[PDB]
Amino acid sequence: VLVIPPGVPYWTYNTGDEPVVAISLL
Amino acid sequence: VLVIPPGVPYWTYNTGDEPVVAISLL
Amino acid sequence: VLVIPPGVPYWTYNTGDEPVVAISLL
Amino acid sequence: VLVIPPGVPYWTYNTGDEPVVAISLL
Amino acid sequence: VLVIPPGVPYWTYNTGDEPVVAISLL
Amino acid sequence: VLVIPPGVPYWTYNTGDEPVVAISLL
Amino acid sequence: VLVIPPGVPYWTYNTGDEPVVAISLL
Amino acid sequence: VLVIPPGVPYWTYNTGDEPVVAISLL
Amino acid sequence: VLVIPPGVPYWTYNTGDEPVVAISLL
Amino acid sequence: VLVIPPGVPYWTYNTGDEPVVAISLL
């Protein structure tokens, strides 16, 4: 993954290869 | 994945290869 | 992952390879 | 991961390889 | 991880290889 | 605006009253 | 704006009253 | 703005009243 | 702005009233 | 701004009233 923003970025998040587990029991 | 925004970006998220598990029981 | 923002960035987060476990029980 | 922001950055966080465990029980 | 910001940085955090355990019980 | 997500949210953005100006000339 | 997420949130952004100006000339 | 997340949050940003000016010329 | 996170937070940023000027010329 | 995190926080930043000027010329 290549990222190169000129100018004025804002909250740049180049997440990559991010396994996610989300389980909720009520 | 290649990302290069000129100008003024805003909340750029170039997520890639992101396995997601979401299970909810009530 | 390559990141090079010119100009004025803001809250740049180039997270990579970030295993996430999130389980909640009420 | 390569990071080189010119100009004026702000709260730059280039986190990488960050295993996360988050489990909450109420 | 390579970091080299010119100009004026602000709260630069290049965290890398940071295992995190966060478990809370109420 | 009232927001109260139980469980495990992700990138919640409850933006409100957000004047936006975006003009670009090439 | 009222926000109260139980469980394990992620990157919660309850931005409110956010005047935004973004003009770019090339 | 009222914020009260139980459990284990992550990068919580309750920005409020945030005038933003972003102008870039190349 | 009222903030009271129980448990184990991470990088909590309750920024409020934050005038921002970001102008870049190349 | 009222902040009272129980448990184990991490890098808590309750910035308030923060005029920011960021201008860069190359």
Side-chain angles (χ1 to χ4, degrees):
Chain A
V1 175
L2 200 144
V3 175
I4 170 184
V8 176
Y10 255 109
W11 280 284
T12 297
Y13 293 86
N14 323 302
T15 299
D17 161 44
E18 194 214 42
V20 175
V21 192
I23 164 176
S24 177
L25 277 78
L26 290 212
Chain B
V1 175
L2 200 144
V3 175
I4 170 184
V8 176
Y10 255 109
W11 280 284
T12 297
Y13 293 86
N14 323 302
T15 299
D17 161 44
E18 194 214 42
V20 175
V21 192
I23 164 176
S24 177
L25 277 78
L26 290 212
Chain C
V1 175
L2 200 145
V3 175
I4 170 184
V8 176
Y10 255 109
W11 280 284
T12 297
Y13 293 86
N14 323 302
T15 299
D17 161 44
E18 194 214 42
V20 175
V21 192
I23 164 176
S24 177
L25 277 78
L26 290 212
Chain D
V1 175
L2 200 145
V3 175
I4 170 184
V8 176
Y10 255 109
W11 280 284
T12 297
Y13 293 86
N14 323 302
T15 299
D17 161 44
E18 194 214 42
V20 175
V21 192
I23 164 176
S24 177
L25 277 78
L26 290 212
Chain E
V1 175
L2 200 145
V3 175
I4 170 184
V8 176
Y10 255 109
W11 280 284
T12 297
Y13 293 86
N14 323 302
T15 299
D17 161 44
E18 194 214 42
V20 175
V21 192
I23 164 176
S24 177
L25 277 78
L26 290 212
Chain F
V1 175
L2 201 145
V3 175
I4 170 183
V8 171
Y10 265 85
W11 281 284
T12 295
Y13 290 86
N14 322 304
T15 299
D17 180 33
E18 180 197 56
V20 184
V21 202
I23 164 176
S24 177
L25 277 78
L26 293 214
Chain G
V1 175
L2 201 145
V3 175
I4 170 183
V8 171
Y10 265 85
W11 281 284
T12 295
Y13 290 86
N14 322 304
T15 299
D17 180 33
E18 180 197 56
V20 184
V21 202
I23 164 176
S24 177
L25 277 78
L26 293 214
Chain H
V1 175
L2 201 145
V3 175
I4 170 183
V8 171
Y10 265 85
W11 281 284
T12 295
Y13 290 86
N14 322 304
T15 299
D17 180 33
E18 180 197 56
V20 184
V21 202
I23 164 176
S24 177
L25 277 78
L26 293 214
Chain I
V1 175
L2 201 145
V3 175
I4 170 183
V8 171
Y10 265 85
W11 281 284
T12 295
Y13 290 86
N14 322 304
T15 299
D17 180 33
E18 180 197 56
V20 184
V21 202
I23 164 176
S24 177
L25 277 78
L26 293 214
Chain J
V1 175
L2 201 145
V3 175
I4 170 183
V8 171
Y10 265 85
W11 281 284
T12 295
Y13 290 86
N14 322 304
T15 299
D17 180 33
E18 180 197 56
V20 184
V21 202
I23 164 176
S24 177
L25 277 78
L26 293 214

